[PDB]
């Protein structure tokens, strides 16, 4: 799991 939960 990456540490950015936003849309790229």
């Amino acid at each position, epitope marked *: *799991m*990456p*540490n*950015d*939960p*936003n*849309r790229n």
Partner: antibody
Amino acid sequence: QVQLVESGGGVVQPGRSLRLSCAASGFTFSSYGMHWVRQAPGKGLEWVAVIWYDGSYKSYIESVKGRFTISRDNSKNTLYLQMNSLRVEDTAVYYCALGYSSGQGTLDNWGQGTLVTVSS
Amino acid sequence: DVVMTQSPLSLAVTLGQPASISCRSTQSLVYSDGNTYLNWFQQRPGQSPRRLIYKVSNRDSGVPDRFSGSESGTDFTLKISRVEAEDVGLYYCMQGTHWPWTFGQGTKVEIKR
């Protein structure tokens, strides 16, 4: 502007349930991951959970895993925290929070919080 | 979980003097992209937290320039160069490199007048 408004907090008996909601507006809500952070009265901030922008990935503190579920409805611009088997230690102000300009490893927008009192 | 330890927990400093809050980490906060995701938040009584620093040393827009952030490997440090009266409150560090994200215990800043 970016605006989050939590609701749903109140008095709840230990072992009962409570659904917190957080209402978002002013930004494209379905592009941002959402977090729950709580603060026991007079104690420190504690990150609780996150949900991805599309709702795929979720992640919880161990102390709430199995009892709390984070979810969201993108069609309603609304964040949810479903709290079951509430303990007295769950007493706190619950904030919803996001990272707007960037969401990577940071938080920069918070609600005003809602107070959950776990008491008979 | 990554344990953020802050010191001091309470800090009393006379107006105009410098003040600094430190945060230590049980694990490296260097992410695979090469950044360290250490954040500093200010919180006034009855107020949502307000970010001051992100990625160790970047100061948030509209945050006064007496605030700075730096890293000594040993630890991370929030600095207020000249303490002003409006700086009472709590201060927290936060790592967002590892899930679960975690704060330090907090630091209370009292003015000595």
